[PDB]
Design a protein around this nucleic acid. Structure first.
Ligand SMILES: [K+]
Ligand SMILES: [K+]
Ligand SMILES: [K+]
Ligand SMILES: [K+]
Ligand SMILES: [K+]
Ligand SMILES: [K+]
Ligand SMILES: [K+]
Ligand SMILES: [K+]
Ligand SMILES: [K+]
Ligand SMILES: [K+]
Ligand SMILES: [K+]
Ligand SMILES: [K+]
Ligand SMILES: [K+]
Ligand SMILES: [K+]
Ligand SMILES: [K+]
Ligand SMILES: [K+]
Ligand SMILES: [K+]
Ligand SMILES: [K+]
Ligand SMILES: [K+]
Ligand SMILES: [K+]
Ligand SMILES: [K+]
Ligand SMILES: [K+]
Ligand SMILES: [Mg+2]
Ligand SMILES: [Mg+2]
Ligand SMILES: [Mg+2]
Ligand SMILES: [Mg+2]
Ligand SMILES: [Mg+2]
Ligand SMILES: [Mg+2]
Ligand SMILES: [Mg+2]
Ligand SMILES: [Mg+2]
Ligand SMILES: [Mg+2]
Ligand SMILES: [Mg+2]
Ligand SMILES: [Mg+2]
Ligand SMILES: [Mg+2]
Ligand SMILES: [Mg+2]
Ligand SMILES: [Mg+2]
Ligand SMILES: [Mg+2]
Ligand SMILES: [Mg+2]
Ligand SMILES: [Mg+2]
Ligand SMILES: [Mg+2]
Ligand SMILES: [Mg+2]
Ligand SMILES: [Mg+2]
Ligand SMILES: [Mg+2]
Ligand SMILES: [Mg+2]
Ligand SMILES: [Mg+2]
Ligand SMILES: [Mg+2]
Ligand SMILES: [Mg+2]
Length: 205
RNA sequence: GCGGGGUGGAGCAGUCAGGUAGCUCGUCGGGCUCAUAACCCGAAGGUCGUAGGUUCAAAUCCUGCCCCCGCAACCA
RNA sequence: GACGGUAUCUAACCAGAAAGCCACGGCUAACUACGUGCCAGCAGCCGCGGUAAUACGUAGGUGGCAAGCGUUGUCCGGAUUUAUUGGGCGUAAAGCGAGCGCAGGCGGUUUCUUAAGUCUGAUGUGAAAGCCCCCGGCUCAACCGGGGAGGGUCAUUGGAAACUGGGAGACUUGAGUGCAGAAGAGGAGAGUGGAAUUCCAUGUGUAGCGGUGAAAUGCGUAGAUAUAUGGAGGAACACCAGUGGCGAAGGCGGCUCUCUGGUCUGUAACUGACGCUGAGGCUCGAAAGCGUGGGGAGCAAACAGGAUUAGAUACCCUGGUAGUCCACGCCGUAAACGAUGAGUGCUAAGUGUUGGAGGGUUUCCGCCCUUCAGUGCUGCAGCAAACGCAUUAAGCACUCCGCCUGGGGAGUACGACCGCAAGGUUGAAACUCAAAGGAAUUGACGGGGGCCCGCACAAGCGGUGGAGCAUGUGGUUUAAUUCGAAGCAACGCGAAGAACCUUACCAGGUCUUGACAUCCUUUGACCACUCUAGAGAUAGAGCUUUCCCUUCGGGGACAAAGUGACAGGUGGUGCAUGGUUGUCGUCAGCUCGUGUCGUGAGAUGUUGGGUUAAGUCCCGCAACGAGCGCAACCCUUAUUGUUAGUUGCCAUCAUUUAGUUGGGCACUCUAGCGAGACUGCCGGUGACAAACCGGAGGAAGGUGGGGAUGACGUCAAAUCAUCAUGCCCCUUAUGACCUGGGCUACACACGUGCUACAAUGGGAAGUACAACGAGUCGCUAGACCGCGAGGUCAUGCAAAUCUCUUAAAGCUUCUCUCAGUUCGGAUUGCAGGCUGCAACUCGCCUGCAUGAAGCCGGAAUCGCUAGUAAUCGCGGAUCAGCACGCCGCGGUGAAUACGUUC
RNA sequence: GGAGGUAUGACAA
């Protein structure tokens, strides 16, 4: 049967909102501005390993914390790339945008980054078992208490879609205290979308 | 010409011996069933072939008429 | 010298004239594109082809072979698939139903002899050519030549004597006889005994009896059933009785007698291999059946009637003929079964029991030991596909016999023999299939079993099904009635808001780089607005017409036009998909690692004894651990310490109409931090455990209540219409704009709801107590007008401050008086209120008027186990307006649970 | 614990 979103289950229990601002009359406007900001960043830095976007609002200002495993690539030489990003975002939003980059130590423990890697490899027609196996190995080396991965769709162009998954360690989705990260990524192939799901259980809080 | 029959869709009662239109199957609707059958609950369907008489009253009695069925319509 | 100017040799010239066939899914070496779409077609078998075909056709490649390649035909092989080499017959095909036996096959020990078999030598022959071995010739090879070898169940002849056979003896172990014993439903014949049934006779006696799931038929007042005494006759032999006995098998059970077979144990007197098997034959052979003649109680095909059933030529009931019985004679078949031919020898044990024998005891009885022949059970070695067999082999061996060779057709057809007949014995083919089959494994299932749980049933309360209306659906209708959902798990569902928009549908009016994108574009404003026509989209005029920098060349930001790439599909496929969700179900399960077991699929763990809500825990266990689940961590609710004390609270005080004001936060309250509940403690039960029962304390006790949380998976479940997306289709149209209409239709069927049918009520008046939530052009106070819906002015509040908001049931009085009503409030007329550009299609609401069905609802069916059902309101999401739906809140507040058969 | 006797359900997927 279906399962609650692993993150949504824990938001407000041990995980916090990414959109870290408060507003009453401008709630809808700020929320949609944030969504457009997130979409724009996703398009812009697609090649960079951008995972989490934390948005804070201070009056007309907007502070944006971007976590990435390639801070140099995001920054550019002498901050050229981050500065170009700021100007484009200022045009987009209509207000001062301050950007703060964060280094994602241990990229192997980020659900979105691991899932993105598997999706990229599938697009390149790597064996799905190989992609998932090496992802699990890297995660365990990084020190995840457990990891779980799943790929669904027309695997290897088969006419009947199915789901193939692997896991290692412990991933107790029902234990609320457990710090379990999750992310869903899609790989666009010749036969259509393949869904990639990654659960990463770190040290519980 | 001799008989037998026309009563709900079908098969039948009732008719002699006037008072009250039924039985079996069927049809329609709803149930039961995963579904169908069976089963269960409701409902419809004829003014008794037809026209006249008799009667207080006719599916029932009388007369005619029309349909349907079997038989006969000629023998040395 | 026919061949013949032939072979051959020499010299000149030229890569120039000289490579196809089949195959490429697996078997099988060889792979991709199109086209195709269960069509065309391929194919030796498996099998390919249903819109993404390495299997079809073409193409490009690749593999095999090559002047050949492939197809068909036929033979051998593979085929151990006729097994001499070299198979089998318990359950896969296969042991005749059993025995008696002629011929035949085979045969115990040993002395001598013989030399038929057997072994061996010599000789003769087994032509030549051809295979094979050496050696040669053609340029090689093919081919040719020379010399050898081989090839016989060969003939003659010489040897050997182990084995088989013959001949002459000997032997006693096998076989049989004698002698002494043992048991027995062995057979045949003639008698005979008791219980019971039925019938007959006679008493008593009265209204039933009998029978089924329930009934009926039937018997009975012409006296039944019952009951008592008798009589008749038939069949079978209770207790004993026992994997007990006996028989070759079929089979044989009261008792007695007569006739009669076999078996077993001793003994070692006798014979001295006389034995085993045994085609064909012969004999015997359950039950049913057949002929002749008897007999006939009970039972009982057929048959009759009563039931059951949709039907019931059956199961059930009441009767009942043949038959069952006897004699004689046929028949000759059975799952005639241990589904296992007979004989013989050999290969651990343990333990019953039948019939014996010997011994050591024991006074006897009896106990112990040994031993033979049966008969069971358990179990090594060994065997087996496995199940299993295992001194009573399916083990190890030898002899003889019967029998099997894929399934069906078929034990059929024809023929023959036998039979009175029924039929039996013998026994094919055409044709057709790629399976049939045995054992075991995992699931699923069972009108199998055991143990359990859930508002599953039971116990209860209230409903739906009946009526009106709201609402969804089917059906029908329509220009359209947009699309999706179809048992549980579709149908107050997507839709948390269809007059317009929404809107995807229809009619009509319209447009074509397009309503919306990115890229090139240019002599830059775009818009916006006024007027005109239009239903509007739109068009036709006027109207105004751009920002940002740099050094000034321009550029960048933005329109807008031109232009082509392109856009755009709520077009299709949820049987190509991602994502999301339903569902079993919050049920306790689902699995993995290592190890071990099994030939193997698999198994174990996860099972078992307890225990739990739980695969929860404990214990035991070839299992030891682990993971996803379970539980916990989380939210809310139930008590409370403390920090805080306004916008909240008011006890202490004084004042106000007012918690008002002052004053204080004490209380409540609010919300952070904590405390608290852990079977923690006590008693009893329990395997010293888990745990279970009870107790104390406490606000709360065993998960306190509730929520969130939904394992691996299941239904090609749902969604291409949230979104995204492979492939397919449309592209001046399936795309886009506008007006109107539709989605709201209405002979009918269903689901879900609301309102009722009244007195536990209707109406009137008075009076009291909540909670969750919402609020800026929004909640709206207060006042005034209005019968009312509402309207006017106007106030506070971005809110624990103000408002929505004095909640309704409730309680107290009055009235109605059982009435289709003073119930009911549908439909309808008129008149209004709002919201909105607009209320006809088609909104909600108000007043007056009208006053529908409805008198508690068939078959059937639903929810709920406590602050629950029932009932009463209040808020909110969507939202200009519009809910009987949904989400949430509080008020009042029960009945019942014996119990798990269904 | 074991052993001999006493109503229906096209076809493919
Ligand atoms: K092939
Ligand atoms: K053989
Ligand atoms: K036999
Ligand atoms: K000889
Ligand atoms: K005897
Ligand atoms: K007879
Ligand atoms: K037998
Ligand atoms: K014995
Ligand atoms: K055949
Ligand atoms: K009702
Ligand atoms: K209803
Ligand atoms: K689906
Ligand atoms: K799906
Ligand atoms: K294992
Ligand atoms: K507190
Ligand atoms: K779509
Ligand atoms: K699509
Ligand atoms: K329906
Ligand atoms: K309703
Ligand atoms: K009253
Ligand atoms: K309207
Ligand atoms: K509203
Ligand atoms: Mg190959
Ligand atoms: Mg081909
Ligand atoms: Mg052969
Ligand atoms: Mg068999
Ligand atoms: Mg057999
Ligand atoms: Mg007989
Ligand atoms: Mg009978
Ligand atoms: Mg036979
Ligand atoms: Mg024995
Ligand atoms: Mg009940
Ligand atoms: Mg109703
Ligand atoms: Mg509902
Ligand atoms: Mg519309
Ligand atoms: Mg329109
Ligand atoms: Mg299990
Ligand atoms: Mg567990
Ligand atoms: Mg265990
Ligand atoms: Mg849990
Ligand atoms: Mg489907
Ligand atoms: Mg569908
Ligand atoms: Mg589409
Ligand atoms: Mg509708
Ligand atoms: Mg009444
Ligand atoms: Mg319950
Ligand atoms: Mg309530």
């Amino acid at each position: 049967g279906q399962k609650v979103h692993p993150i949504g289950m824990r938001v407000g229990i041990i995980r916090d909102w990414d959109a870290k601002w408060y507003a009453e009359k401008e709630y809808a406007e700020f929320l949609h501005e944030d969504l457009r900001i997130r979409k724009f960043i996703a398009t812009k830095l697609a090649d960079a390993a951008v995972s989490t976007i934390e948005i804070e609002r201070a009056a007309n200002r907007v502070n944006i914390s971007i976590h990435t495993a390639k801070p140099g690539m995001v920054i550019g030489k002498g901050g050229s790339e981050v500065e170009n990003l700021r100007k484009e975002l200022n045009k987009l939003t209509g207000k001062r945008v301050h950007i703060n980059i964060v280094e994602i130590k241990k990229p192997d423990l980020d659900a979105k980054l691991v899932g993105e890697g598997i999706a990229r490899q599938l697009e390149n027609r790597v064996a799905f078992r190989r992609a998932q196996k090496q992802a699990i190995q890297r995660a365990m080396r990084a020190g995840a208490k457990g990891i779980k991965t799943q790929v669904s769709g027309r695997l290897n162009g088969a006419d009947i879609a199915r789901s193939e998954g692997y896991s290692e360690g412990t991933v107790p989705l029902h234990t609320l205290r457990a710090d379990i990260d999750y992310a869903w990524e899609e790989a666009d192939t010749t036969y259509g979308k393949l869904g990639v799901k990654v659960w990463i259980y770190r040290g519980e809080i």
